[PDB]
């Protein structure tokens, strides 16, 4: 037998997730790639990213704690 009966609870919401429930990251290490600008400038990549809006984009990872901002760097 391969038939499975389901029970549903529909009386009230059990939780409310954010509209951005499904969010994404970019690993902080990607910022060390010399092609960072080329990669995130990709129109194809932005089209795919827009498909997931609304969402958070978290820029973070192990490299977060080994990155220093330098306002003189070019």
């Amino acid at each position: 037998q391969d038939v499975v009966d389901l029970d549903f609870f529909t009386q009230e919401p059990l939780h409310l997730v954010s509209p951005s429930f499904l969010s994404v990251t970019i690993d902080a290490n990607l910022a060390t790639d010399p092609r960072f600008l080329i990669l995130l400038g990709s129109p194809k990549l932005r089209t795919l990213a827009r498909g997931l809006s609304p969402a958070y984009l978290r820029f973070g990872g192990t490299k977060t704690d080994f990155l220093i901002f330098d306002p003189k760097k070019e």
């Binding site: 997730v17 954010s18 499904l22 990251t25 990607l30 060390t32 978290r58 977060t64 704690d65 306002p71």
Partner: protein
């Protein structure tokens, strides 16, 4: 093993523009290992970044540190939870004195809750929990280097997530009850992914199950490691091509609403057939107030047939069934929706996601090793309106 690197205004602008132009909300992790002599966080580099972003009018949220439970391993520096909490309070004061005084702050981005991590989280939330807008933690099921194909399909592996989420809420309920809990970084396998696994159709069982459990259990936001990057757990590969988890993610967004409900299997064995139920996404023009979205995973090696309970047993149902494109089966990087391969129309154009309407009153077929969404039309559920 990890060295310091610098980044430029240019890098910041690249990242911000990517987010802004894609309709995404940027969260930027600040470096927590910049320390004064007395081991306080040194905020002076963050101050420079803040002033720069303030000067460009950038709308950004913040984190401070990543996996602080590992700082000893990674950098030979130990920061306890109390101190990390104090450091977050100091960041919160800098934010409040900046041009975006209402910017959000999340943390502490701990790993999953082993004994030492749970202690760090508890002390952090006692010390610094007043200034965070949500609590972030990280989860992976496996090590990318040792993961097997059977691991990705094993309900006993999938179920371990449940006890991790329970343990996190135990800590949060004992220190900051009601504070929102986010998965701040999560995927199948750590260490960049598992190859021909984390980037295939087979990765979708872990990803959809984690989304279903997270929503069911009260997690508000889940952040997928990674959208794009070196690791095999990327949604989009090196050639900018979307992988099966991208398409799964896009379908989930189109169909699944914010109100979480519950579905469960009647039989005693609830390991291999996994089911989740939300209100249908109200932004979807094909559906109407009161419709339900069911999603289901079949980890049995045969087709299962699902029967909907009264009062939904004769409703019109739209099927959205995902299966791999051959010849590589579960190890495929290509996926079909109701028999049609999913592919970009061109570089600016996503395809429509086409339903298969089922005949009213039919049971819901779910093939072996597959996952599907089902929209119950005219469900007229009051909780959803």
């Amino acid at each position: 093993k990890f060295k310091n690197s610098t980044y430029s205004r240019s890098s910041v602008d690249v990242l911000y523009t990517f987010a802004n132009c894609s309709g995404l909300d940027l969260i930027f992790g600040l470096n927590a290992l910049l320390r004064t002599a007395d081991l306080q966080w040194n905020s002076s580099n963050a101050q420079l970044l803040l002033d720069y972003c303030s000067s460009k009018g950038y709308n950004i949220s913040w984190e401070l540190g990543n996996e602080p439970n590992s700082f000893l391993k990674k950098a030979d520096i130990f920061i306890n939870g109390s101190q990390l909490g104090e450091d977050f309070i100091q960041l919160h004061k800098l934010l409040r004195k900046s041009t975006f005084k209402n910017a959000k702050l999340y943390g502490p981005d701990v790993g999953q809750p082993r004994r030492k991590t749970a202690k760090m989280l508890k002390s952090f939330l006692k010390a610094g929990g007043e200034v965070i807008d949500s609590v972030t933690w990280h989860h992976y099921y496996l090590n990318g280097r040792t993961a097997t194909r059977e691991d990705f399909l094993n309900p006993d592996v999938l179920d371990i997530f449940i006890s991790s989420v329970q343990k996190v809420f135990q800590v949060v309920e004992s220190t900051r009850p009601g504070k929102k809990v986010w998965l701040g970084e999560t995927s199948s396998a750590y260490g960049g992914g598992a190859p021909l696994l984390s980037d295939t159709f087979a990765a979708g069982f872990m990803w959809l199950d984690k989304l279903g459990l997270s929503a069911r259990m009260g997690i508000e936001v889940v952040m997928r490691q990674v959208f794009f990057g070196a690791g095999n757990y990327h949604l989009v590969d090196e050639n900018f091509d979307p992988l099966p988890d991208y398409w799964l993610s896009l379908l989930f967004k189109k169909l699944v609403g914010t109100k979480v409900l519950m579905a469960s299997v009647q039989g005693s064995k609830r390991r291999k057939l996994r089911v989740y139920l939300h209100c249908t996404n109200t932004d979807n023009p094909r559906y109407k107030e009161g419709d339900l979205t069911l999603y289901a995973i079949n980890l049995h090696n045969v087709t299962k047939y699902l029967r909907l309970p009264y009062p939904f047993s004769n409703k019109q149902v739209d099927k959205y069934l995902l299966r791999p494109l051959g010849p590589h089966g579960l190890l495929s990087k290509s996926v079909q929706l109701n028999g049609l391969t999913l592919k970009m129309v061109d570089d600016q154009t996503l395809p429509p996601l086409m339903e298969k309407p089922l005949r009213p009153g039919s049971s819901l077929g779910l093939p072996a090793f597959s996952y599907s969404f089902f929209v119950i039309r005219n469900a007229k559920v009051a909780a959803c309106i």
